[PDB]
Enzyme design. Structure first.
Site, short mmCIF file in Angstrom:
data_model
loop_
_atom_site.label_atom_id
_atom_site.label_comp_id
_atom_site.label_asym_id
_atom_site.label_seq_id
_atom_site.Cartn_x
_atom_site.Cartn_y
_atom_site.Cartn_z
N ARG A 192 13.34 18.32 36.53
CA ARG A 192 12.26 18.45 37.51
C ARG A 192 12.21 17.25 38.44
NH1 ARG A 192 9.81 22.77 38.26
NH2 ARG A 192 9.55 22.34 40.50
N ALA A 210 6.79 30.51 40.63
CA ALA A 210 7.78 29.88 39.76
C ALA A 210 9.01 29.45 40.54
CB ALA A 210 8.18 30.85 38.65
N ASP A 211 9.65 28.39 40.08
CA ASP A 211 10.97 28.09 40.60
C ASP A 211 12.00 28.44 39.53
OD1 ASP A 211 11.17 25.99 38.71
OD2 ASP A 211 10.84 24.44 40.23
N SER A 212 13.28 28.11 39.79
CA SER A 212 14.33 28.56 38.87
C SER A 212 14.38 27.74 37.58
CB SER A 212 15.69 28.56 39.58
OG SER A 212 16.05 27.24 39.99
#
Ligand code: 8Q1
Ligand code: EDT
Ligand code: PLP
Lengths: 75, 83, 126, 402
Positions: B39, A33-35
């Protein structure tokens, strides 16, 4: 559908088989996961369990077990 | 003042507020767009361009807050698929 | 706006289907044209004393055409062949609250009743 | 009190982008001055908002703000472009060219000019919905003042070769107008790369408010237009009347949002459009797409469902807001001239439905629409005498209809 519904949320949110979602796993170091994912994941837990998780608590929820912990301790 | 802290706080604030849209079409669009845009811009490196994106997000958060409230004052029935 | 009377003929369909065109006691009316957006097939079954005891229909057309033909099919049941010729486009439109731009639908359903009855009567001359 | 239907009719009109309503609201509350009021702050701030909006419209299409004239809609803009150019060069030019699938305001403006003694060529289109560029070339006459060809069709979504048409008109010094109401903010538009002389824009087709539009009028080389609305000379003498500040603010904001969102929207709508078309066609026989998919805006999908009447399918899809080509539904008026123009059989033209996918459409909505469409086409076919006859091997093209 135990309170380990927590596990199903983490897997759905991170795209990970329910098998890799172990109690010891961290979202970032172990589940990719990223933030941005972890913001969404915390919100997903808030919505699944009808609870409000404030910032100083959210920042402690970094592993699968930590999420389990918090939800059991807040009804 | 930290761009990363600003950014993650805005992200959470924007998602939380957008989820309050009463209209399915605004709500589902805003949550999705916010998720796609943060994103898409994840790998921007120029501090000045980041700040520009941050200032636009803060302006859009104001839009969301006002439009959510207006949409609550003049709400209508849910769509067939929300059943 | 929504017409509850007309939509009912589609949402709660009744008498949709076919009878045996080869029967001497079945009359088939097929009226309209695909190019005009409205084709109605109406079949009636008459018993040996001249009472219509069953009917079926199939319609290609807007909801008011489906309702017009569907209503006509219900209404011919239990009429004698002579009583079924009583049925008028205007009664059909009245029952369905048809607006003036759809009255052609109730006229075509009247045409279908009479076509089915004329088919039946042509089979009857021994 | 009941649940509302899904909106799948964006070509008829769009909801307002919350960003657009937010930009408009100050002008509906405190900034209510008349933009033509020259002697106080209410006028100054209203005039500044108008000029800001004008720049936003110009930026989207590659124009100079001075080339943007505000109007009440694309209907008015099309009237200004066609009647204004025709009437201005009437001493030397009396021929215009347009096509058979144009929007009714272009066609009726041309019809009105024919009654004024103008000659109009209504070009046919191919079965794809696209004009033949070489037929356009051959039709241009010495007294031809204007060519008008829409960018995206409102009924079938086909895209005309605007840049190629501009090349033809420019080279022959014939003015080129395009009704871009369905394209603005959805596909790239650049007035110079496409060699456009005039262009019509509608606010409500692009998440902006109803009752507002614009017309681009090229200033170099200068295109001249006779004004249609008489008055005190607002909008450089081309559109007299009070410029409606809140509406034009909303139009400029819609244009700025569209400029930022066009690429994202096109990717998302393309995918939803593919999904809708492929899921319906793989589940139902005898389904035909109206218009060439190779030159097509994906947000406007026009399909025909053989052996089922269009209005009855719309009725059957009770929880989906759609539109159809059957004459009973179009405005109580006439059958689809567009479907006739591309050579659709009359019966199939009664069988066509338009599906609109927009900025706010969800994959859920598309899947719900697809599911209901499959179920109801099957159900209507079961009620259809034409389907029954085809299932028994009858050739419909051989019956003697009444
Ligand atoms: C009604 C309509 C509403 C629509 C609203 C659309 C809102 C879009 C706003 C776009 C805002 C931005 O990109 S704000 C700019 C975001 N991009 C950056 O900041 C570049 C540097 N990247 C990082 O610092 C990290 O990747 C980080 C992203 C913090 C994650 O950190 P985690 O430690 O994994
Ligand atoms: O289909 C439905 O029932 C509506 N969605 C919308 C509910 N969502 C919307 C989103 O986050 O995309 C969140 C909410 O209820 O606030 C669930
Ligand atoms: C292709 C086309 N032209 C013209 C119009 C008319 O635009 P308005 O409703 O703004 O007058 C529309 C809508 C349209 O889709």
């Amino acid at each position: 559908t135990i309170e380990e519904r927590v596990k199903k949320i983490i897997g759905e949110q991170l795209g990970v088989k329910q098998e890799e979602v172990t109690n010891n796993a961290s979202f970032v170091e172990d589940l990719g996961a990223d933030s941005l994912d972890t913001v969404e994941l915390v919100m997903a837990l808030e919505e699944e369990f009808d609870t409000e998780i404030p910032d100083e608590e959210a920042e402690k929820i970094t592993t699968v077990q930590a999420a389990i912990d918090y939800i059991n301790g807040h009804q | 003042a930290s761009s990363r802290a600003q950014v993650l706080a805005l992200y959470r604030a924007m998602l939380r507020e957008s989820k309050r849209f009463s209209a399915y079409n605004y709500r589902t669009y805003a949550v999705r767009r916010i998720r796609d845009a943060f994103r898409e811009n994840k790998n921007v490196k120029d501090p000045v361009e980041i700040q520009t994106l941050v200032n636009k997000a803060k302006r859009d958060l104001g839009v969301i807050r006002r439009q959510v409230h207006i949409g609550q004052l003049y709400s209508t029935d849910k769509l067939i698929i929300e059943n | 706006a929504l017409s509850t009377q007309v939509v009912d003929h589609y949402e709660n369909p009744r008498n949709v289907g076919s009878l045996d065109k080869t029967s001497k006691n079945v009359g088939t009316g097929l009226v309209g044209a695909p190019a005009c957006g409205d084709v109605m097939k109406l079949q009636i079954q008459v018993d040996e004393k001249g009472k219509i005891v069953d009917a079926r229909f199939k319609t290609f057309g807007c909801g008011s055409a489906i309702a017009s033909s569907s209503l006509a099919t219900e209404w011919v049941k239990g009429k004698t062949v002579e009583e079924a010729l009583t049925i008028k486009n205007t009664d059909i439109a009245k029952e369905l609250c048809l607006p003036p731009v759809k009255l052609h639908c109730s006229m075509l359903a009247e045409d279908a009743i009479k076509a089915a009855l004329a088919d039946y009567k042509l089979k009857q001359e021994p | 009190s009941s649940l509302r239907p899904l909106y799948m009719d964006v070509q008829a009109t769009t909801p307002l982008d919350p960003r657009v309503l937010d930009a408009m609201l100050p002008y509906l509350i405190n900034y209510y001055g008349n933009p033509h009021s020259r002697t106080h702050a209410y006028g100054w701030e209203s005039e500044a908002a108008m000029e800001r909006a004008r720049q936003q419209v110009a930026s989207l299409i590659g124009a100079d703000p001075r080339e943007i004239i505000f109007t009440s809609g694309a209907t008015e803009s099309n009237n200004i472009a066609i009647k204004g150019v025709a009437r201005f060069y009437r001493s030397r030019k009396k021929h215009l060219i347009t096509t058979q699938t144009e929007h009714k305001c272009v066609l009726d403006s041309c019809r009105s000019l024919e009654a004024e003694g103008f000659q109009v060529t209504y070009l046919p289109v191919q079965k794809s919905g696209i004009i033949d560029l070489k037929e356009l070339e051959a039709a241009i006459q010495p007294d031809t003042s204007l060519v008008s060809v829409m960018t995206v069709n409102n009924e079938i979504g086909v895209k005309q070769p605007i840049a190629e048409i501009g090349r033809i008109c420019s080279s022959r010094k014939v003015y080129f107008h395009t009704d871009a109401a369905q394209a603005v903010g959805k596909i790239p538009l650049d007035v110079n790369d496409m060699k456009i002389d005039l262009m019509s824009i509608s606010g409500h087709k692009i998440y902006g408010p109803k009752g507002v539009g614009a017309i681009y009028i090229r200033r170099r080389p200068r295109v001249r237009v006779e004004a249609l609305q008489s008055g005190g000379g607002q909008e450089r003498g081309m559109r007299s009347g009070t410029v409606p500040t809140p509406l034009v603010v909303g139009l400029g904001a819609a244009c700025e949002v569209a400029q930022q969102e066009m690429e994202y929207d096109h990717k998302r709508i393309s995918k939803l459009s593919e999904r809708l078309i492929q899921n319906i066609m793989k589940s139902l026989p005898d389904v035909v797409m109206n218009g060439d998919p190779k030159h097509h805006y994906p947000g406007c999908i026009n399909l025909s469902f053989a052996y089922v009447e269009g209005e009855s399918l719309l009725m059957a899809l009770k929880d989906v807001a759609l539109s159809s080509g059957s004459a009973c539904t179009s405005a109580s008026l006439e059958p689809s001239y567009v479907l006739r123009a591309i050579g659709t059989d009359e019966d199939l033209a009664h069988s066509s439905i338009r599906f609109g996918i927009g900025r706010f459409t969800t994959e859920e909505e598309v899947d719900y629409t697809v599911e209901k469409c499959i179920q109801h086409v099957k159900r209507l076919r079961e009620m259809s005498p034409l389907w029954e006859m085809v299932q028994d091997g009858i050739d419909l093209k051989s019956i003697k209809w009444t």
